[PDB]
Paper text:
We previously screened a compound library from the open chemical repository of the National Cancer Institute, which led to the identification of the potent and selective PARP10 inhibitor OUL35.27 From the same screening, a TBT derivative OUL40 (NSC295701) emerged, showing an IC50 = 3.2 μM against PARP10. This led us to hypothesize that 1 could be a new nicotinamide mimicking compound with the potential to inhibit multiple PARPs. Indeed, when assayed against a panel of two poly-ARTs, PARP2 and TNKS2, and two additional mono-ARTs, PARP14 and PARP15, IC50 values in the low micromolar range (1.2–5.3 μM) were obtained. With X-ray crystallography, we confirmed the binding of 1 into the nicotinamide binding pocket of TNKS2, PARP14, and PARP15 active sites. The inhibitor binding mode is highly similar in all three enzymes, where two hydrogen bonds are generated between N1 and N2 of the triazole ring with glycine and serine residues, respectively. In addition, π–π interactions are present between the inhibitor core and tyrosine residues. Our preliminary studies on 1 revealed the potency of the compound scaffold by showing reasonable inhibition even in the absence of the typical benzamide moiety.
The human diphtheria toxin-like ARTD family contains PARP and tankyrase (TNKS) enzymes that can catalyze both mono-ADP-ribosylation (MAR, mono-ARTs) as well as generate elongated and branched chains of poly-ADP-ribose (PAR, poly-ARTs). The PARPs and TNKSs form a family of structurally and functionally diverse enzymes, which are involved in the regulation of various key biological and pathological processes such as DNA repair, cell differentiation, gene transcription, and signal transduction pathways. PARPs and TNKSs use nicotinamide adenine dinucleotide, NAD+, to transfer an ADP-ribose (ADPr) unit onto target proteins or nucleic acids with the release of nicotinamide. Here, we report our contribution in identifying a set of compounds based on a new nicotinamide mimicking chemotype,triazolo[3,4-b]benzothiazole (TBT), able to inhibit different PARP family enzymes with submicromolar activity depending on the substitution pattern around the central core. The binding mode of the TBT scaffold was studied through the synthesis of analogues and their complex crystal structures with PARP2, TNKS2, PARP14, and PARP15.
Author numbering:
A (entry chain B): 481 to 678
B (entry chain A): 482 to 678
Write the structure that this text describes.
Amino acid sequence: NLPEHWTDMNHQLFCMVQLEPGQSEYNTIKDKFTRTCSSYAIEKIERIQNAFLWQSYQVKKRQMDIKNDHKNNERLLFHGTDADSVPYVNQHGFNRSCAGKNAVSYGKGTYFAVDASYSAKDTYSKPDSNGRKHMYVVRVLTGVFTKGRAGLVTPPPKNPHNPTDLFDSVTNNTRSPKLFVVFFDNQAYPEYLITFTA
Amino acid sequence: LPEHWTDMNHQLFCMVQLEPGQSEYNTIKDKFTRTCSSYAIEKIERIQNAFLWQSYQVKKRQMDIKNDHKNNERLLFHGTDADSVPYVNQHGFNRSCAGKNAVSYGKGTYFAVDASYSAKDTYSKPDSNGRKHMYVVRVLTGVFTKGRAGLVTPPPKNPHNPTDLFDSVTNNTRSPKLFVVFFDNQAYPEYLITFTA
Ligand SMILES: Cc1ccc2c(c1)sc1nncn12
């Protein structure tokens, strides 16, 4: 079941679809971005239609919904990256083995921001040769989360006496989360690519 | 959920001890004894992990479509320490969990063609009581190439398309003895053999 609102991809498995401003789908992403990035301007927003990534992500979403007690397991988050990474993320998603060490490390995993502003820093969304910055808008299975720790390679157990019964993700602060870290493949779907400039 | 699994009372995870001398136990024992006939089998357990199985079959179906054929699966061995057994049973193989074992063909999970390679103490580390642990694993080796140190994913098939990757890497493409996979849910742990020297 690929979402019915996607463009027909004609038996092909990947497509980047450029959105039209004035449509709700474009305007809602612009507003979530501009709420903390008013100093920047969007060149374009592309919807990522990746059938394999969607299938694997929605399988993990279904399992986390079954495992957790009627939780909102999914957040819409931002990820700034450099241009060299964009073809790889587009095709293969977020690979923790490729992840930057974050300035404040709450674990060795893939980082995702509540605020576009955080992802808009040049450290993440490194401007390319043409001054273009790249930011993903990402469905993330944050699930049940705890404050992380720089040493984590997996999320911590909820209970030290049950080592395999893990939290889903970790955050910088559980009362005001600004960051989430995930430690497993297909726990994040890159849904949109915002291309933007100063 | 495979026919040869036994009922789980609507539960998602069960380890099920095989009966000695029945067909399923005999098949798995023979794979091990081919190179480990000098070892002693305490027991074999079928890992029934619905979640792991479902993500693996999804990845299998994707690879069968992409490779345009259905010879992507191999049966391989993985030795591990007793303290890693609960994690593998519940969450499968994880490339970020890898201490002072060699990663000379890349930073992925290592699987052996021969049980005797997994039977080494450096991999199947004997516990206090001399008990060693080896998994029989369904691995999506798909299309493979020679590996090398420092790989985080397998190499591209053609560098004119950097994103079309090989499925796995090996030590030797003519006569492979190990495979490394770089993604979660490319490996399903199907049996656990508890044994001693
Ligand atoms: C280089 C290397 C590293 C780990 C490893 C092998 C070979 S064969 C095997 N069976 N379980 C673990 N491993």
